[PDB]
Amino acid sequence: ASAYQRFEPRAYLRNNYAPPRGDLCNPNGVGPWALRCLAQTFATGEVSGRTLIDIGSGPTVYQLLSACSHFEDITMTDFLEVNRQELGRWLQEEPGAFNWSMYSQHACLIEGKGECWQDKERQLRARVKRVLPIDVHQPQPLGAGSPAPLPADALVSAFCLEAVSPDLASFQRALDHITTLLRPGGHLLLIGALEESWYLAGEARLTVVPVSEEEVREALVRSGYKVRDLRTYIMPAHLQTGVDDVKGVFFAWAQKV
Ligand SMILES: Nc1ncnc2c1ncn2[C@@H]1O[C@H](CSCC[C@H](N)C(=O)O)[C@@H](O)[C@H]1O
């Protein structure tokens, strides 16, 4: 937990979204796969509404590229102040912001609505209304009087829950906790690491709860969801860079019933 204090946003981005784990040219890379999962889901025109909340966004934005065209009010979050700042720098187009163009581009490519990436980024930057601190450990993750429209029509979270839970039970709770933020009949799009027990972020070393695909499924069920879709990406050996011990990545499309 306190370990997340030494968490360096730039070391994290560099380790996971810079080449080779970030190259999008090769179709069999985790990047193409993940953006594709997101794109396809939203393309079914079933996950929509007005407001959408991104849990534990960290310093990344990709997780919303295909999503931003379906929700006009978007709320980004994260426990660390450093991250919320790193996001602001990208959102305001301030200097030293991480470059996500490559991703915006591939997202536009995958969607195939002939959209240029500048337009896609413009839309995202516009629909992201706020960036609020959050804590998935508290029963009311966002707090008491949150500027964020509640309950949201949909939720999105990539690599958070399992990266902040010491064991399955915690994982389960933090899932129940955020579930409360989602309006019934709503949609949840969760991404995460499969069987990962640790990952580096600069000086900080995070101890994760290694979880499988069935454990993730069952956990979603227990928290009151119906698993619309669940896919797995087994990490190739060339993407095993030393920054962690992840085995694969998962994608879930759940709906609060
Ligand atoms: N208690 C907590 N509740 C919510 N987020 C937390 C948290 N403790 C740490 N975090 C944040 O969860 C993130 C895990 S890393 C995931 C980053 C990003 N969503 C991506 O897709 O890569 C970090 O940004 C960390 O600051």
Ligand SMILES: O=S(=O)(Nc1ccc(Cl)cc1)c1ccc2c(c1)CNCC2
């Ligand atoms: O899938 S990734 O290798 N990179 C990656 C993901 C998604 C896209 Cl679109 C491109 C690249 C990855 C992202 C985050 C984390 C980990 C791995 C393991 N550590 C916890 C956090």
